[PDB]
């Protein structure tokens, strides 16, 4: 596994990021928001996005694994770590750092509606949605791509560190 | 509330910069597993480990209090335990803070049970006074007074973790 091309700079997901925080400040003006990052990916987007927002933030970490081919096609996943904080009658921003066939999300989206949260939007560093296996509209997306590693995201959990996001083979 | 800035969000960059630097000479030509403990170490995590070089695998860890137990003897639940292969690895145990170290020694024993080449603790805040066992951090980037604090990643009853400072509360 290497490292072909650098895909997005650092600067470009520094500026991106604070674009993404400035919109999600504007639909929120005055009002408390919890923050849902899923984990591991999207730790490094979840850290420098929260950091933009002036908004009282409150944020938790959730993390699923797969049940093997019934994930691939029907998204269901088992909870690994389930949230610990109350976000009944909150407004909640998921994040993630890609969202390709959406099952997943979807899957979590049922989930967090349990709790019934006031209002729940969906973040994503990196959107795929020519990948789509099911109806899942993010309401903030940072980039449209076309494998990839670097800001969080892992090939067999190798290069999270990078500041950039890179191509591999 | 808030009362005081207490370390800027350019200190904490400079600092995190440094606190890299000293982890990449003392792991020269290696790679390295950060084992970050959640939530608190998460930002300093996401700064230090893109200051890093080398080939980094990173990973993290969740404990919890017993209750009195755990603020006498360290004792904590493991909430959840780790992933990745640390057996003959080097590993950096990342934290926020490190106050009395009964909590980071008892999670020392359970790493040392996963046989790593090399395991040292890196912590953002260090409390030396406060010690209630023998626990010297390998990576320290401040010592704080015996305060309570918030931002950067820490809370106080799960708010203000999105500051991009460290900030004394009252
Ligand atoms: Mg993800
Ligand atoms: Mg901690």
Redesign the interface.
């Known amino acids: 596994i290497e490292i072909k091309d650098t895909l997005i700079s650092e600067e470009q997901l520094q500026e991106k990021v604070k674009e993404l925080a400035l919109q999600i400040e504007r639909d929120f003006e005055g009002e408390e928001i919890v923050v849902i990052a899923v984990?591991?990916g999207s730790?490094?987007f979840?850290?420098?996005l929260?950091?933009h927002?002036k908004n009282?933030?409150?944020?938790?970490?959730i993390?699923a694994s797969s049940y093997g081919n019934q994930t691939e096609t029907t998204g269901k996943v088992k909870l690994?770590?389930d949230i610990d904080?109350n976000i009944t009658g909150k407004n909640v921003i998921v994040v993630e750092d890609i969202i390709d066939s959406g099952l997943t999300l979807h899957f979590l989206k049922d989930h967090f509606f349990m709790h019934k949260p006031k209002a729940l939007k969906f973040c994503t560093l990196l959107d795929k949605p020519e990948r789509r296996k099911v109806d899942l509209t993010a309401e903030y997306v940072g980039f449209q791509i076309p494998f990839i590693v670097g800001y969080?995201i892992d090939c067999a959990?190798?290069y999270?560190?990078?500041?950039f996001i890179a191509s591999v083979v």
């Open positions: 984990l591991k730790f490094v979840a850290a420098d929260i950091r927002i009282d933030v409150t944020i938790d970490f993390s690994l770590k904080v969080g959990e190798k999270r560190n990078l500041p």
